[PDB]
Design a binder for this molecule. Structure first.
Ligand SMILES: [K+]
Ligand SMILES: [K+]
Ligand SMILES: [K+]
Ligand SMILES: [K+]
Ligand SMILES: [K+]
Ligand SMILES: [K+]
Ligand SMILES: [K+]
Ligand SMILES: [K+]
Ligand SMILES: [K+]
Ligand SMILES: [K+]
Ligand SMILES: [Mg+2]
Ligand SMILES: [Mg+2]
Ligand SMILES: [Mg+2]
Ligand SMILES: [Mg+2]
Ligand SMILES: [Mg+2]
Ligand SMILES: [Mg+2]
Ligand SMILES: [Mg+2]
Ligand SMILES: [Mg+2]
Ligand SMILES: [Mg+2]
Ligand SMILES: [Mg+2]
Ligand SMILES: [Mg+2]
Ligand SMILES: [Mg+2]
Ligand SMILES: [Mg+2]
Ligand code: NA
Lengths: 178, 158, 186
RNA sequence: CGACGUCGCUUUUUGAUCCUUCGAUGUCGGCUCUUCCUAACCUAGCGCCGCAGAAGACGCUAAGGGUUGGAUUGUUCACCCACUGACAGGGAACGUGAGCUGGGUUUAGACCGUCGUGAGACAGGUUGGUUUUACCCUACUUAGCUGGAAAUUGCGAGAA
RNA sequence: UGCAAGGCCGGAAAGAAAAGAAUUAGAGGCACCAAGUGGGCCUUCUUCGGUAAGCGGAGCAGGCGAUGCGGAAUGAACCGCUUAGGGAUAUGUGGCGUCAAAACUUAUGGGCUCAUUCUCGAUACGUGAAAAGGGUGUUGGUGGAUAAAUCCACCGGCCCCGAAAAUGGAUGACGCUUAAGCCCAAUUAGUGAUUGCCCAUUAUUCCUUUGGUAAGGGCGGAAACAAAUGGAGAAAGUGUAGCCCUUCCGAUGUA
RNA sequence: GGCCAGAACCAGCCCUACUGCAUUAUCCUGUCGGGGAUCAAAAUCCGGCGGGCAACGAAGUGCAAGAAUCUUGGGUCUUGGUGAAAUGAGCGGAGUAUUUGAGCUGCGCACGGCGGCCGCACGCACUGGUUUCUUCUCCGUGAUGCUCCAUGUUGGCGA
């Protein structure tokens, strides 16, 4: 399945005024389901970092960043999440994926599964494609083997939806109720 | 328990500000109040003679009668399903001239001046343009907005 | 998860290991042993030319991986039992009352344990041979012999567990039947 | 086993509250009789002990079984005598009054003490003082009759 | 000739510019005569007394009372939506293993979890069941250390221990564990874009009724026209079988 | 026949098909240098440098207005009809055209570099030109009808 998060580059600034005739222009990296959430995250970051509110600023661009050609790569994702008891916890993880958006979506799913963290309590600090020899975790390093192979065992193979049946003869493919 | 006298619950209301104590000044005495004027009724705690009730502190109205040492003001007060026009009598030290119609009077005078200029043929001032229009932005410096590792350490005390 | 985890064992020349549906059978001199490991769900291979037994776990966590070494140890135990067998020597230790042990064919009877009048009877399976060493060599010694380690033991334990001191101090009253030496028969 | 600190649980205790009931839900104890709970007294296993033995302490799984006779008191309690392997703790509208009993409480008679000018009052003592109704419906316990697989019908067809 | 007041006579009027520069299912006022009320109770936040209480007392605003309907199994007041009487089509809250409509148990999604007698868990509100403390259960982080990878402290996640009551019993019943549990994410799946499906007294629309602070037309018989063998009616009108036609909007309700 | 059922067509709805414009560059290539891993490689990875459309079933990114007429989609036992005033891009007459998009272009002007010159993706005016392919366009019927009712087809059933 394609990733549920998209790579957005949000470029914006504060609205020029008499105190600030030439405001600084900020570029922002976000992974969001849509550009509305992308702009919301951009303005949250501008408010909590540069003391600029969305009501006193404007957005020069909210474009998407196209993914590179699909290649099996190792992606280092530096990410952070908030919990009430633990405060802010920052971690760095390695993922095997074909795209930056895919790796970041995998990271979001992993954080939700293992730490019960939702999208709005997670800040992605960085995502980058690292070489094979810089991978630290063995769970990711095990896919660097030049001759890597394995059989598919314990596979629940379902029939095509048009050919699925309720009652099938015991040792034949004949369907009794379908 | 709680009583219901004329000056109940006015400990911070009828109190002078910090390092602003004192009886009213000469410019308060020399101010001219006319019938039909708008005035704010702010009680001066140092006078204590002719002070309004605690309700009328901060309300503005139109003076309806002028008296040697007093002023009568018509203040709107909502009771139940309607607002009454209560005519309160205070001393002149507890009223200030109101600037509520300042912008309206300035707008009227600006319109008259503009009409005079148009009649005389003088060039009118340039019209303002909205800041909500589009345009090409040439940035002096472009920065990267991102969350860094040091931010969490900075926000974490001790 | 770990994509591949292996455990490799070397098969001696005399013994042959055969695996079919997670059912291992080791056949050599001195007998044949069989183990049912259908509860484990591992990948068991035997290379006859290289005389190797491999057990593999694909995409396994720590709990599934822990069974690789257990399977390897089980197969090694069956190989060792088929080759040299297993011999457990138990000894009757007592302070005051002699513990009289009589061994018939596959039958053990223990009497006068702590002066009790109750007779303790144990039936040994035909796959395990029980004998009594004559007192001239070593006093009150019973020897269990067999190919299966799990069967030679258990018998030595049902004998230890039946002679247990009850309602008394166990720091004192140290008498019982204790396994002293575990070894082979060939 | 354990300060002084700290977190629980319980509803066999009192309190708090006033939601139900004032054209009425019989109010204490006992007796009888069943059942349930476990936070286990005895009884079956089993750990540990400052556990030699004997006798115990502490814990574990377990509620299958059992848990008494009396003196004083209306008592619940309490206390004492005695037997026992042991004489555990409780719940069931503070189980159980058309089951009983009515000793207590709580009318009207009367006496005392204290209080009241009195009539009278006491959460003080004392004595005497109507316990109604099932033939109804369930529920239990026994006792009969009798249809029914489309659980009355379809002709609707399935044999361990 | 200055002020203050009551007039009168002129003048000018973006009838309020431009700068983000209001909006309105905005007829304003003004009487008269009456009825039921005058035990209230529930929340979200704020709040006082009390160890607390399904306890007592306030503030603001909503809601029950007075009111159904769809959903949380069940519940005054929670969630959705508020009610003429019928259809179609959409939704909302809530769901799609069976009960029970809907994934005939969806994916060509990702992880996590195994729980032996109140029997893991799965519905907010509703501690309408639980902590302090612990776990060498498993799987994630963070900072060290050492060198074939180790081990040391420290934080998550789910599970387990803590965790005892009286009729037999309640995720909802069954059951589920390549979940039918938990966290996240899809909508037919790296194929080529942006609505899977099922349920309301809700929305949209259609038909009919009823009532308007209702809105309009027509109403000087238009000419003709027997039967045997196109027709009828047409009222200047509050209310009728409503004078007729067209149009729009509303319709629940205790006292 | 004022009954039952089926097919036709109308009108109005309600569903579906059929898609263009703009974006991309942290991208796409090639080639050098590193770096990596191998038996040797290659690749993941990082720098230069030269190109450039990953290319319309490219992208799951913004917005889409594409006459279900061409080109007999479906539905309406969820509406009313059978022409008792059919208002139609739909009928009925004419005509082979018409303008309106896309190309490609003219001049001035905006606009963008850089300080009057250069650019201009083709905005604005001349409703500029061209016609290379893309579309059909133009006329027509009051009520002398105030209101309501009254007009198919094919079976089955009713003689
Ligand atoms: K009684
Ligand atoms: K007296
Ligand atoms: K008395
Ligand atoms: K008595
Ligand atoms: K008496
Ligand atoms: K309601
Ligand atoms: K899954
Ligand atoms: K009407
Ligand atoms: K009338
Ligand atoms: K039909
Ligand atoms: Mg009664
Ligand atoms: Mg009764
Ligand atoms: Mg019992
Ligand atoms: Mg009782
Ligand atoms: Mg009774
Ligand atoms: Mg009685
Ligand atoms: Mg009596
Ligand atoms: Mg039958
Ligand atoms: Mg009353
Ligand atoms: Mg529907
Ligand atoms: Mg179903
Ligand atoms: Mg009428
Ligand atoms: Mg009504
Ligand atoms: Na003040």
């Amino acid at each position: 399945v394609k990733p549920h998060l998209r790579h957005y580059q949000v470029v914006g600034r504060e609205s020029p005024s008499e105190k600030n005739p030439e405001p600084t222009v900020y570029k922002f990296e976000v992974f969001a389901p849509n550009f509305v959430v992308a702009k919301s995250r951009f303005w949250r970051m501008m408010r909590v970092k540069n003391k600029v509110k969305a009501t006193h600023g404007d957005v020069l661009s909210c474009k998407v960043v196209k993914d590179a050609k699909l290649v099996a790569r190792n992606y280092l994702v530096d990410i952070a999440y908030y919990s009430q008891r633990c405060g802010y916890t920052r971690m760095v993880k390695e993922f095997r994926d074909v795209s930056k958006t895919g790796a970041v979506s995998q990271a979001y799913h992993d954080l939700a599964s293992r730490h019960r963290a939702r999208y709005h309590n997670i800040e992605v600090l960085n995502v980058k494609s690292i070489p094979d020899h810089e991978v630290k975790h063995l769970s990711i390093a095990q896919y660097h083997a030049p001759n890597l192979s394995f059989p598919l065992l314990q596979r629940r193979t379902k029939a095509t939806r048009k050919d699925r049946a309720i009652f099938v003869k015991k040792n034949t493919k004949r369907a009794v109720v379908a | 328990v709680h009583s219901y006298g004329y000056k109940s619950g006015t400990r911070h209301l009828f109190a002078k500000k910090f390092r602003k104590h004192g009886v009213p000044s000469v410019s308060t005495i020399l101010t001219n109040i006319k019938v039909g004027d708008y005035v704010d009724v702010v009680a001066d705690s140092a006078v204590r003679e002719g002070m309004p009730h605690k309700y009328y502190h901060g309300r503005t109205g139109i003076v309806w009668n002028v008296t040697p040492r007093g002023v009568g003001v018509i203040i709107n007060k909502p009771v139940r399903t309607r607002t009454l026009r209560k005519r309160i009598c205070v001393r002149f030290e507890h009223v200030r001239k109101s600037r509520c119609q300042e912008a309206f009077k300035a707008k009227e005078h600006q319109f008259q001046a503009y009409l005079a200029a148009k009649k005389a043929g003088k060039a009118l001032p340039p019209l303002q343009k909205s800041s909500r229009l589009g345009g090409i932005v040439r940035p002096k410096n472009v920065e990267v907005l991102a969350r860094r590792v040091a931010d969490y350490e900075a926000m974490v005390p001790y | 998860v770990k994509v591949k985890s292996l455990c490799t064992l070397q098969i001696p020349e005399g013994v042959t290991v055969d695996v079919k549906g997670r059912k291992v059978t080791v056949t050599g001199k001195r007998g044949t042993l069989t183990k049912d490991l259908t509860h484990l769900q591992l990948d068991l291979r035997v290379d006859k030319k290289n005389r190797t037994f491999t057990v593999i776990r694909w995409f396994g966590s720590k709990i599934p991986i822990a069974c690789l070494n257990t399977t390897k140890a089980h197969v090694q135990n069956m190989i060792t039992g088929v080759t040299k067998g297993y011999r457990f020597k138990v000894r009757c230790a007592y302070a005051h009352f002699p513990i009289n042990v009589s061994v018939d064919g596959q039958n053990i009877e223990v009497r006068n344990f702590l002066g009790e009048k109750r007779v303790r009877r144990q039936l040994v399976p035909n796959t395990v041979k029980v004998s009594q060493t004559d007192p001239s060599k070593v006093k009150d010694e019973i020897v269990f012999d067999g190919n299966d380690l799990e069967q030679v033991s258990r018998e030595a334990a049902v004998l230890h567990q039946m002679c247990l001191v009850k309602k008394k101090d166990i720091r004192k009253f140290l008498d019982g039947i204790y396994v002293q030496t575990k070894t082979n028969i060939e």
